[PDB]
Amino acid sequence: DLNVEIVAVERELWSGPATFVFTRTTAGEIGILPRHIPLVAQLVDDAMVRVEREGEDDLRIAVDGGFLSVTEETVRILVENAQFESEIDADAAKEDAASDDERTAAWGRARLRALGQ
Amino acid sequence: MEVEYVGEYSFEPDPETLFDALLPRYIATRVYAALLEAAASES
Amino acid sequence: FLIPNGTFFAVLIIFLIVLGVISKWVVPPISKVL
Amino acid sequence: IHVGHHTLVFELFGMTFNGDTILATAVTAVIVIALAFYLRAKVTSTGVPSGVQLFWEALTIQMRQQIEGSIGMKIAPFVLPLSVTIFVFILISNWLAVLPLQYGGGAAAELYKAPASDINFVLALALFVFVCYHAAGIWRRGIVGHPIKVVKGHVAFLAPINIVEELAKPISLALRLFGNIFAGGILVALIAMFPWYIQWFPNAVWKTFDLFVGLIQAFIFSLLTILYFSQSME
Amino acid sequence: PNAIITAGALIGGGLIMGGGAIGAGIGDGIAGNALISGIARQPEAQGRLFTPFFITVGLVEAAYFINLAFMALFVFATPGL
Amino acid sequence: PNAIITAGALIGGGLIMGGGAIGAGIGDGIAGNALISGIARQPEAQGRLFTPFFITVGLVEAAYFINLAFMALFVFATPGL
Amino acid sequence: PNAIITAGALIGGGLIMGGGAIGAGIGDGIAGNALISGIARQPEAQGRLFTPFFITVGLVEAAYFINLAFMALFVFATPGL
Amino acid sequence: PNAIITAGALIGGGLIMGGGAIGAGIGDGIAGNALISGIARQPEAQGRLFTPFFITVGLVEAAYFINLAFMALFVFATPGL
Amino acid sequence: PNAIITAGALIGGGLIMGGGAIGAGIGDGIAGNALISGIARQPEAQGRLFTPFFITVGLVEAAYFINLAFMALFVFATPGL
Amino acid sequence: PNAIITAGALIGGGLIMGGGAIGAGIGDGIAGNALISGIARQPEAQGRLFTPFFITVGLVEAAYFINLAFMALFVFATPGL
Amino acid sequence: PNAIITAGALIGGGLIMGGGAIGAGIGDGIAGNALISGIARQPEAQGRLFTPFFITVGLVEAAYFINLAFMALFVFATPGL
Amino acid sequence: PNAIITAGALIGGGLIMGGGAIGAGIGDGIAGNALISGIARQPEAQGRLFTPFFITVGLVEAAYFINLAFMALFVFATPGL
Amino acid sequence: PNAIITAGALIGGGLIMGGGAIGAGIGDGIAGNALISGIARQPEAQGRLFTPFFITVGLVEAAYFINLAFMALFVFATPGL
Amino acid sequence: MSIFIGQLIGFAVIAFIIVKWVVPPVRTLMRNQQEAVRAALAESAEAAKK
Ligand SMILES: COc1cc([C@](O)(CCN(C)C)[C@@H](c2cc3cc(Br)ccc3nc2OC)c2cc(OC)nc(OC)c2OC)cc(OC)n1
Ligand SMILES: COc1cc([C@](O)(CCN(C)C)[C@@H](c2cc3cc(Br)ccc3nc2OC)c2cc(OC)nc(OC)c2OC)cc(OC)n1
Ligand SMILES: COc1cc([C@](O)(CCN(C)C)[C@@H](c2cc3cc(Br)ccc3nc2OC)c2cc(OC)nc(OC)c2OC)cc(OC)n1
Ligand SMILES: COc1cc([C@](O)(CCN(C)C)[C@@H](c2cc3cc(Br)ccc3nc2OC)c2cc(OC)nc(OC)c2OC)cc(OC)n1
Ligand SMILES: COc1cc([C@](O)(CCN(C)C)[C@@H](c2cc3cc(Br)ccc3nc2OC)c2cc(OC)nc(OC)c2OC)cc(OC)n1
Ligand SMILES: COc1cc([C@](O)(CCN(C)C)[C@@H](c2cc3cc(Br)ccc3nc2OC)c2cc(OC)nc(OC)c2OC)cc(OC)n1
Ligand SMILES: COc1cc([C@](O)(CCN(C)C)[C@@H](c2cc3cc(Br)ccc3nc2OC)c2cc(OC)nc(OC)c2OC)cc(OC)n1
């Protein structure tokens, strides 16, 4: 199986193995599953990550400025800032998405996508 | 930065643009490490 | 109709004239405007 | 469809001349000369440029940029006038055919047939360019050095291929211009076989697109002239 | 005897234009595919891509129009007749 | 004599139209593949991508048109008739 | 006499359909490849990706249709018959 | 007699099937290439990709059937017979 | 009279299988290119790549098979003979 | 009469071989291009890549072989003779 | 007898020129696609890319005109006439 | 009789070699495209890439060789003559 | 008698060079696309990439040469005259 | 006679097409360029005055 680790710049966000990972790279969506070739990919400013945890439910994460890496042992998601699906506030994300600033609007819309709006 | 060479993958959308976009992040994370370590030394 | 003719020269001459004029009337003036 | 049969044909100096092609070339030359003279009279460095000044400036800038990006302007100052005159000559020759200068005999006759539709015109332009950049290569490399580089090219063991490609440079550069305009002369003739009440539609669309086709052909011919010069000078 | 030569010339000219059209269409499509891909990746590159484009087109069109010319020679001025 | 020339002209026009259809269809497919890929990559570039497209389509569709004309010459106005 | 013309017209129509089918199939395949790749890379693009597609298909289906028409002329209304 | 007409019809229908087979095979292979690449790059999208796929395969395989509808017309009906 | 029809049928069947083999080979090659590239890039999805593969091949191999069948009908059961 | 059928069968077998060779060469080239790229970017993956590749080459070389068979049936065991 | 010779020579020269047109146009389109893509990615590489490009085109054009050189030999010299 | 069979055999062998050359050239071009891309991306892969390449070329040239042989059989040992 | 033989030889040689031209042009264009892409992506690699290139063009242009040679045998030394 | 009338209708169509869809963009380019150059000369003059 994949050893999935999500590493925020300030801390190691989450390091649970999973069967399948999914996210929108700058070149389009990408789905990583065991024994994928090594890869490095910049995620779109509003990318979101789905991790298909084997036992528990799916794990949907909003990510800001993420970089995905694939290696035979692990799948890394390096992150500037991230939030799991449960902690997202829909109104706050909507308010941020209306901002003209690219970074804040991108983060808000990423939070919306992870929330499943 | 000096480019370091030592004795002994795929990329999207190409290696050059990704490298250019990543170097600022490397600068930011090294400055972050410097600030964290300065806070520790200050304490 | 693919066989050349005397018109060949009759064309070349004319073209040369233009090549001359544009070489000085337009080369000079254009370069000057530039 | 009665291809060929150049009208106004005459004989002089013991050789035959297609009068209609010469007349079309002269018409194009006088249009280009009028544009050049109107520029010369109204060329302003400090004032607001006229329409002809803007046209000439854009064309000269494009050709100069091509020369800069292919072979330095210092090495090739003489090729900018050649490119500009070539472009304007072919462009005006092709675009003057858009005028409704055709009528019915009962076959269709055309008062102004694009000179490029004649083999002599395109062959003359191509051979002039051929001699010009071969002479430029001789000047920049030497009488004996230039042929050696031309045959060798960039790969020595491909010597015959080069010798073909070289001979292909004029031929194509001529025929590419020939067939494109020659073909048009047939379509307008073919479309003339239609009755007037449905002839205008195919004729209209064909000539509307032939404006762009002639523009692109003039641009391509000039661009390939510049490219061949850059190749043959170094 | 002239009828057989004329029919053969018509078939040969049809072959010439069929090959020329195939080559022109496919090569122009490929060159324009490169042009459109470049302008999609770098929309500000359009101006600089028309030079290498019309060069390429200039080459491709040649293979067509040369052929076109020769079809006329096949059709209107059949080499044998 | 007329029958042979007419049959040869029909075959030549069939070749002309087959080649023209192949070239036009494949070139249009390639150019539109570039257009679709670009508009997938850069939706905001949609309009900017329609300039190099219609030029490319203009180049192939021109050839096709010429072909469609010459077949009309072969079939209805058999030159060697 | 009419037998030769009819056989030539049938061969020409067969060529027209062969070329039209090749062009239509390959161009539609290429355009659909672009569409499928675009939809795979991102779902929300689908709505827009059908505008360039149906344009390209419209160009590739037109050519076929034109050929489809001319065979109908070649075989049912054989010119020069 | 019409034996020449029958031979011409057989050759024409053979051309129709040859072109239709080439176009269908190559075009649907290109569409399947897109489908396989999309599923490989995003295995969870399989069903999604089957919408555009079967559209282009619908266009590519339609051209075949139409050709199949005409070869049958050529050899079994032979309109010019 | 039967000799001419037989020769025409042989030529038509040759065309049928020529087109069928071209389409089959090229389409199978393209689909296999997709499969090999996807297995190289996403080896774990090898199984999920075979459903869209055998489908595509299933289409391609269908186009060939039909053609082959008709070739038989052309050569062994020559219509109009 | 046998001469006409033999000439037609030779032409048809030549068509079958031309189509089979085109399809086999191009499909093998495409599959091998996939294999070469996969082994370039994944040096240790070549083993796995040889599984789909030989499948693809299986479907390609198969078609060729079938053609190679029927040409013999056309040339040595001419059905119509 | 010379009528059959001239018709066959014209058809052979038409085949030569059609194949040359197809090969030259498509190969030039592919090489120019590479050139345009490389210039779009790295404009400064323009002058660098024209060295290999004009080698490859230099070969492709040589395939064309050599064929043309032979077509003349078919139609104007007609060996075996 | 003999003349007709010989002419048909010559045309069939010409078709054999034309298809074989098309397949060989295009397959070699595609395989060498993969080889060149791999060597450009992976210098040290140059040694490892020549094994798949030689396999691909082996599958391509073999087809050509086979065609060549049969073409000889057509023109030097014309069956049915 | 000889007239038909050498007319068929002319058509067969035209087919040989048509196929050779198509294969050589397209394969050289594809190999040149690879070389140009490699030089654009790896400017310092040019000297290296000419060894894989000329090998590829070596196999491609070889086929053409053979075809050319055989056309001479077809045309100037036609078998079975 | 008829050929001339048909071609003249076609040329009227061509003129209408270029005037409606081709002339406007070319005129906009010329006005942006010529007008812009006028503006620039003006700016240069004002700057010299300054
Ligand atoms: C059923 O619809 C059509 C369309 C056509 C076209 O040829 C396109 C066919 N193709 C897509 C395969 C078409 C055309 C012509 C062009 C000519 C030049 Br030069 C340059 C670009 C062109 N682009 C073109 O379409 C983008 C055309 C031709 C024409 O002829 C009198 N009148 C038109 O009306 C303005 C016309 O546009 C609709 C033809 C036709 O007749 C059988 N039926
Ligand atoms: C199975 O059904 C069909 C379909 C057709 C088509 O040609 C498409 C075939 N293809 C998919 C291979 C089809 C068509 C025509 C188009 C013409 C232009 Br210009 C531009 C786009 C087109 N797109 C088209 O389909 C997307 C068509 C043709 C037609 O002819 C009188 N009438 C139609 O009814 C409006 C029609 O639409 C259904 C033909 C046919 O004949 C046997 N049978
Ligand atoms: C020497 O072996 C073969 C194989 C064939 C095939 O056509 C493959 C051709 N290919 C490789 C180009 C083959 C086939 C047919 C298919 C039909 C459809 Br619809 C969809 C998928 C198919 N997939 C197929 O192969 C996976 C086939 C045909 C057939 O005909 C009665 N009987 C079969 O059962 C034994 C059979 O194998 C399932 C034909 C043949 O004839 C000389 N000889
Ligand atoms: C092996 O069996 C087949 C299959 C066909 C097809 O043509 C596909 C062939 N191809 C894969 C090469 C096929 C078909 C037709 C389509 C028509 C349009 Br419009 C749009 C999409 C189509 N997609 C199709 O399959 C994806 C078809 C045609 C048909 O006509 C008698 N009856 C069918 O139902 C009984 C049928 O199956 C739905 C033909 C055939 O000929 C003997 N034998
Ligand atoms: C020695 O060179 C060859 C090779 C062949 C092949 O056809 C491959 C041709 N290729 C390059 C297009 C080849 C073949 C056949 C296959 C059939 C099916 Br179904 C599925 C896969 C196949 N894979 C194959 O090769 C991987 C073949 C055929 C055959 O027939 C009597 N005897 C063979 O054993 C000696 C044989 O080699 C295994 C033919 C030939 O003609 C004289 N000469
Ligand atoms: C006037 O120029 C040419 C060149 C040729 C070539 O065939 C290439 C044609 N192509 C580029 C389309 C050429 C050739 C042959 C090769 C043979 C093998 Br095996 C492998 C690679 C080859 N590569 C080749 O060029 C890359 C060739 C042929 C030849 O004929 C006796 N003598 C040669 O040496 C003196 C020779 O080399 C230069 C033919 C020709 O005929 C009119 N005229
Ligand atoms: C250079 O001049 C040649 C070359 C050939 C080849 O066919 C290759 C042609 N191609 C590149 C277009 C060649 C060949 C044959 C192969 C057969 C199989 Br199965 C599998 C791979 C092959 N690879 C091959 O080269 C990669 C060949 C054939 C042969 O037969 C008499 N004798 C050979 O030994 C001397 C031989 O090698 C040189 C033929 C020929 O004849 C006119 N002249």
mmCIF file of all heavy atoms in Angstrom, chain F residues 21-78, unseen atoms left out:
data_model
loop_
_atom_site.group_PDB
_atom_site.id
_atom_site.type_symbol
_atom_site.label_atom_id
_atom_site.label_comp_id
_atom_site.label_asym_id
_atom_site.label_seq_id
_atom_site.Cartn_x
_atom_site.Cartn_y
_atom_site.Cartn_z
ATOM 1 N N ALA F 21 -10.730 14.836 -48.835
ATOM 2 C CA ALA F 21 -11.439 14.492 -47.611
ATOM 3 C C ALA F 21 -10.479 13.980 -46.552
ATOM 4 O O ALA F 21 -10.555 14.391 -45.393
ATOM 5 N N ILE F 22 -9.551 13.097 -46.928
ATOM 6 C CA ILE F 22 -8.589 12.592 -45.953
ATOM 7 C C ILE F 22 -7.802 13.748 -45.352
ATOM 8 O O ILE F 22 -7.718 13.898 -44.127
ATOM 9 N N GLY F 23 -7.233 14.595 -46.211
ATOM 10 C CA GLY F 23 -6.402 15.679 -45.719
ATOM 11 C C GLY F 23 -7.179 16.658 -44.865
ATOM 12 O O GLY F 23 -6.755 17.009 -43.764
ATOM 13 N N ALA F 24 -8.339 17.099 -45.354
ATOM 14 C CA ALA F 24 -9.135 18.069 -44.615
ATOM 15 C C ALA F 24 -9.598 17.494 -43.286
ATOM 16 O O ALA F 24 -9.474 18.144 -42.246
ATOM 17 N N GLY F 25 -10.126 16.270 -43.294
ATOM 18 C CA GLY F 25 -10.614 15.684 -42.061
ATOM 19 C C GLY F 25 -9.515 15.489 -41.037
ATOM 20 O O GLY F 25 -9.672 15.848 -39.870
ATOM 21 N N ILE F 26 -8.377 14.934 -41.459
ATOM 22 C CA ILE F 26 -7.313 14.656 -40.503
ATOM 23 C C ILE F 26 -6.670 15.950 -40.015
ATOM 24 O O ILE F 26 -6.353 16.088 -38.827
ATOM 25 N N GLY F 27 -6.471 16.924 -40.906
ATOM 26 C CA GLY F 27 -5.915 18.196 -40.479
ATOM 27 C C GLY F 27 -6.847 18.959 -39.559
ATOM 28 O O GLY F 27 -6.406 19.552 -38.570
ATOM 29 N N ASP F 28 -8.145 18.963 -39.870
ATOM 30 C CA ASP F 28 -9.121 19.577 -38.982
ATOM 31 C C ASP F 28 -9.145 18.871 -37.638
ATOM 32 O O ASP F 28 -9.235 19.519 -36.593
ATOM 33 N N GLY F 29 -9.064 17.541 -37.644
ATOM 34 C CA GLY F 29 -9.026 16.811 -36.393
ATOM 35 C C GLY F 29 -7.812 17.158 -35.559
ATOM 36 O O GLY F 29 -7.914 17.330 -34.348
ATOM 37 N N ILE F 30 -6.649 17.288 -36.198
ATOM 38 C CA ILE F 30 -5.430 17.607 -35.457
ATOM 39 C C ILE F 30 -5.488 19.030 -34.911
ATOM 40 O O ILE F 30 -5.156 19.280 -33.743
ATOM 41 N N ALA F 31 -5.915 19.985 -35.741
ATOM 42 C CA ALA F 31 -6.018 21.367 -35.284
ATOM 43 C C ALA F 31 -7.046 21.503 -34.170
ATOM 44 O O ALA F 31 -6.821 22.217 -33.187
ATOM 45 N N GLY F 32 -8.184 20.818 -34.297
ATOM 46 C CA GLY F 32 -9.182 20.855 -33.247
ATOM 47 C C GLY F 32 -8.764 20.102 -32.006
ATOM 48 O O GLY F 32 -9.205 20.430 -30.906
ATOM 49 N N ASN F 33 -7.914 19.088 -32.154
ATOM 50 C CA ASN F 33 -7.316 18.451 -30.990
ATOM 51 C C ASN F 33 -6.455 19.447 -30.233
ATOM 52 O O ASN F 33 -6.522 19.541 -29.002
ATOM 53 N N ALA F 34 -5.648 20.218 -30.962
ATOM 54 C CA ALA F 34 -4.867 21.266 -30.315
ATOM 55 C C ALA F 34 -5.779 22.283 -29.640
ATOM 56 O O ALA F 34 -5.515 22.711 -28.512
ATOM 57 N N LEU F 35 -6.855 22.678 -30.319
ATOM 58 C CA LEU F 35 -7.769 23.672 -29.762
ATOM 59 C C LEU F 35 -8.441 23.157 -28.494
ATOM 60 O O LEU F 35 -8.532 23.871 -27.489
ATOM 61 N N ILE F 36 -8.922 21.913 -28.525
ATOM 62 C CA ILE F 36 -9.579 21.325 -27.363
ATOM 63 C C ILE F 36 -8.596 21.192 -26.210
ATOM 64 O O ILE F 36 -8.924 21.499 -25.058
ATOM 65 N N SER F 37 -7.376 20.730 -26.496
ATOM 66 C CA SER F 37 -6.380 20.594 -25.443
ATOM 67 C C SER F 37 -6.034 21.947 -24.835
ATOM 68 O O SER F 37 -5.880 22.066 -23.616
ATOM 69 N N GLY F 38 -5.901 22.978 -25.670
ATOM 70 C CA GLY F 38 -5.594 24.299 -25.152
ATOM 71 C C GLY F 38 -6.716 24.869 -24.307
ATOM 72 O O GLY F 38 -6.472 25.437 -23.241
ATOM 73 N N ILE F 39 -7.960 24.725 -24.767
ATOM 74 C CA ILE F 39 -9.089 25.237 -24.005
ATOM 75 C C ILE F 39 -9.313 24.426 -22.739
ATOM 76 O O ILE F 39 -9.908 24.928 -21.780
ATOM 77 N N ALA F 40 -8.854 23.174 -22.710
ATOM 78 C CA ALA F 40 -8.817 22.431 -21.458
ATOM 79 C C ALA F 40 -7.753 23.000 -20.529
ATOM 80 O O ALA F 40 -7.998 23.215 -19.338
ATOM 81 N N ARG F 41 -6.559 23.251 -21.069
ATOM 82 C CA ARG F 41 -5.470 23.807 -20.275
ATOM 83 C C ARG F 41 -5.771 25.237 -19.843
ATOM 84 O O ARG F 41 -5.646 25.579 -18.662
ATOM 85 N N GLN F 42 -6.168 26.089 -20.790
ATOM 86 C CA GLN F 42 -6.365 27.517 -20.545
ATOM 87 C C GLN F 42 -7.734 27.936 -21.063
ATOM 88 O O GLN F 42 -7.858 28.420 -22.196
ATOM 89 N N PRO F 43 -8.791 27.761 -20.265
ATOM 90 C CA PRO F 43 -10.115 28.218 -20.724
ATOM 91 C C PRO F 43 -10.151 29.696 -21.063
ATOM 92 O O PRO F 43 -10.777 30.089 -22.055
ATOM 93 N N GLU F 44 -9.473 30.532 -20.272
ATOM 94 C CA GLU F 44 -9.472 31.966 -20.534
ATOM 95 C C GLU F 44 -8.808 32.302 -21.860
ATOM 96 O O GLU F 44 -9.034 33.392 -22.396
ATOM 97 N N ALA F 45 -7.999 31.396 -22.402
ATOM 98 C CA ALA F 45 -7.357 31.596 -23.692
ATOM 99 C C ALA F 45 -8.239 31.174 -24.857
ATOM 100 O O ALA F 45 -7.800 31.268 -26.008
ATOM 101 N N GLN F 46 -9.465 30.718 -24.587
ATOM 102 C CA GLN F 46 -10.345 30.239 -25.649
ATOM 103 C C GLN F 46 -10.315 31.165 -26.858
ATOM 104 O O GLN F 46 -9.920 30.764 -27.957
ATOM 105 N N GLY F 47 -10.715 32.423 -26.665
ATOM 106 C CA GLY F 47 -10.712 33.359 -27.774
ATOM 107 C C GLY F 47 -9.348 33.506 -28.413
ATOM 108 O O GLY F 47 -9.223 33.451 -29.640
ATOM 109 N N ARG F 48 -8.304 33.663 -27.598
ATOM 110 C CA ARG F 48 -6.959 33.784 -28.140
ATOM 111 C C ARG F 48 -6.550 32.555 -28.936
ATOM 112 O O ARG F 48 -5.672 32.654 -29.798
ATOM 113 N N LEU F 49 -7.163 31.400 -28.669
ATOM 114 C CA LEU F 49 -6.843 30.185 -29.403
ATOM 115 C C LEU F 49 -7.607 30.065 -30.711
ATOM 116 O O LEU F 49 -7.259 29.209 -31.532
ATOM 117 N N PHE F 50 -8.633 30.886 -30.931
ATOM 118 C CA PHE F 50 -9.401 30.796 -32.163
ATOM 119 C C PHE F 50 -8.741 31.524 -33.325
ATOM 120 O O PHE F 50 -9.142 31.311 -34.473
ATOM 121 N N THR F 51 -7.738 32.370 -33.060
ATOM 122 C CA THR F 51 -7.004 32.997 -34.159
ATOM 123 C C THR F 51 -6.074 32.000 -34.836
ATOM 124 O O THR F 51 -6.190 31.800 -36.059
ATOM 125 N N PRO F 52 -5.143 31.349 -34.132
ATOM 126 C CA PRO F 52 -4.313 30.333 -34.797
ATOM 127 C C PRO F 52 -5.110 29.155 -35.319
ATOM 128 O O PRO F 52 -4.650 28.477 -36.244
ATOM 129 N N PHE F 53 -6.287 28.888 -34.753
ATOM 130 C CA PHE F 53 -7.106 27.781 -35.227
ATOM 131 C C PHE F 53 -7.661 28.071 -36.616
ATOM 132 O O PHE F 53 -7.398 27.332 -37.571
ATOM 133 N N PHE F 54 -8.421 29.159 -36.749
ATOM 134 C CA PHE F 54 -9.058 29.455 -38.027
ATOM 135 C C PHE F 54 -8.033 29.706 -39.120
ATOM 136 O O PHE F 54 -8.324 29.493 -40.301
ATOM 137 N N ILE F 55 -6.833 30.160 -38.758
ATOM 138 C CA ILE F 55 -5.758 30.248 -39.741
ATOM 139 C C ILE F 55 -5.388 28.856 -40.229
ATOM 140 O O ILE F 55 -5.364 28.584 -41.435
ATOM 141 N N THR F 56 -5.130 27.940 -39.293
ATOM 142 C CA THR F 56 -4.824 26.564 -39.669
ATOM 143 C C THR F 56 -5.975 25.954 -40.451
ATOM 144 O O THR F 56 -5.780 25.399 -41.539
ATOM 145 N N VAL F 57 -7.193 26.062 -39.919
ATOM 146 C CA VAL F 57 -8.361 25.603 -40.658
ATOM 147 C C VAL F 57 -8.455 26.329 -41.988
ATOM 148 O O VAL F 57 -8.881 25.749 -42.995
ATOM 149 N N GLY F 58 -8.057 27.601 -42.026
ATOM 150 C CA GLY F 58 -8.060 28.320 -43.286
ATOM 151 C C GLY F 58 -7.089 27.727 -44.287
ATOM 152 O O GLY F 58 -7.355 27.711 -45.491
ATOM 153 N N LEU F 59 -5.948 27.229 -43.805
ATOM 154 C CA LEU F 59 -4.947 26.682 -44.714
ATOM 155 C C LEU F 59 -5.395 25.346 -45.295
ATOM 156 O O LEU F 59 -5.250 25.110 -46.499
ATOM 157 N N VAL F 60 -5.934 24.458 -44.460
ATOM 158 C CA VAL F 60 -6.388 23.162 -44.956
ATOM 159 C C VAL F 60 -7.653 23.326 -45.791
ATOM 160 O O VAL F 60 -7.751 22.803 -46.909
ATOM 161 N N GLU F 61 -8.628 24.084 -45.281
ATOM 162 C CA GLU F 61 -9.886 24.243 -46.003
ATOM 163 C C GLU F 61 -9.681 24.941 -47.337
ATOM 164 O O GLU F 61 -10.463 24.730 -48.271
ATOM 165 N N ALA F 62 -8.649 25.777 -47.452
ATOM 166 C CA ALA F 62 -8.297 26.307 -48.761
ATOM 167 C C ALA F 62 -7.932 25.173 -49.707
ATOM 168 O O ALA F 62 -8.530 25.025 -50.779
ATOM 169 N N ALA F 63 -6.989 24.322 -49.294
ATOM 170 C CA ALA F 63 -6.587 23.200 -50.135
ATOM 171 C C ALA F 63 -7.798 22.370 -50.530
ATOM 172 O O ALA F 63 -8.042 22.130 -51.719
ATOM 173 N N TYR F 64 -8.599 21.970 -49.541
ATOM 174 C CA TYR F 64 -9.814 21.221 -49.835
ATOM 175 C C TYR F 64 -10.631 21.927 -50.904
ATOM 176 O O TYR F 64 -11.014 21.322 -51.913
ATOM 177 N N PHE F 65 -10.872 23.227 -50.724
ATOM 178 C CA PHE F 65 -11.668 23.955 -51.703
ATOM 179 C C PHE F 65 -11.063 23.808 -53.088
ATOM 180 O O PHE F 65 -11.755 23.449 -54.048
ATOM 181 N N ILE F 66 -9.751 24.025 -53.199
ATOM 182 C CA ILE F 66 -9.092 23.869 -54.491
ATOM 183 C C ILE F 66 -9.366 22.478 -55.040
ATOM 184 O O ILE F 66 -9.791 22.315 -56.190
ATOM 185 N N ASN F 67 -9.174 21.457 -54.203
ATOM 186 C CA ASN F 67 -9.487 20.097 -54.620
ATOM 187 C C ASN F 67 -10.919 20.010 -55.121
ATOM 188 O O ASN F 67 -11.177 19.539 -56.236
ATOM 189 N N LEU F 68 -11.867 20.511 -54.325
ATOM 190 C CA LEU F 68 -13.266 20.423 -54.719
ATOM 191 C C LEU F 68 -13.498 21.123 -56.048
ATOM 192 O O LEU F 68 -14.364 20.707 -56.827
ATOM 193 N N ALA F 69 -12.729 22.175 -56.333
ATOM 194 C CA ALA F 69 -12.847 22.833 -57.627
ATOM 195 C C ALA F 69 -12.310 21.942 -58.738
ATOM 196 O O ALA F 69 -12.968 21.748 -59.767
ATOM 197 N N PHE F 70 -11.123 21.365 -58.537
ATOM 198 C CA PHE F 70 -10.488 20.614 -59.613
ATOM 199 C C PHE F 70 -11.279 19.358 -59.951
ATOM 200 O O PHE F 70 -11.388 18.986 -61.125
ATOM 201 N N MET F 71 -11.848 18.696 -58.944
ATOM 202 C CA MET F 71 -12.764 17.599 -59.232
ATOM 203 C C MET F 71 -13.914 18.081 -60.103
ATOM 204 O O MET F 71 -14.293 17.417 -61.075
ATOM 205 N N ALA F 72 -14.482 19.243 -59.771
ATOM 206 C CA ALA F 72 -15.539 19.795 -60.606
ATOM 207 C C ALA F 72 -15.049 20.014 -62.029
ATOM 208 O O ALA F 72 -15.834 19.917 -62.979
ATOM 209 N N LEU F 73 -13.759 20.310 -62.195
ATOM 210 C CA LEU F 73 -13.191 20.388 -63.536
ATOM 211 C C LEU F 73 -13.109 19.006 -64.170
ATOM 212 O O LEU F 73 -13.448 18.836 -65.345
ATOM 213 N N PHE F 74 -12.664 18.006 -63.409
ATOM 214 C CA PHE F 74 -12.535 16.661 -63.961
ATOM 215 C C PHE F 74 -13.892 16.087 -64.347
ATOM 216 O O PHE F 74 -14.039 15.492 -65.420
ATOM 217 N N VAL F 75 -14.898 16.271 -63.495
ATOM 218 C CA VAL F 75 -16.142 15.525 -63.637
ATOM 219 C C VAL F 75 -17.076 16.198 -64.636
ATOM 220 O O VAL F 75 -17.630 15.542 -65.526
ATOM 221 N N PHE F 76 -17.270 17.510 -64.507
ATOM 222 C CA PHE F 76 -18.225 18.219 -65.350
ATOM 223 C C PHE F 76 -17.580 18.871 -66.565
ATOM 224 O O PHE F 76 -18.259 19.078 -67.578
ATOM 225 N N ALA F 77 -16.295 19.196 -66.492
ATOM 226 C CA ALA F 77 -15.582 19.904 -67.550
ATOM 227 C C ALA F 77 -14.303 19.166 -67.908
ATOM 228 O O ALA F 77 -13.216 19.745 -67.954
ATOM 229 N N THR F 78 -14.421 17.857 -68.147
ATOM 230 C CA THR F 78 -13.270 16.991 -68.377
ATOM 231 C C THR F 78 -12.292 17.666 -69.335
ATOM 232 O O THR F 78 -12.579 17.784 -70.533
#
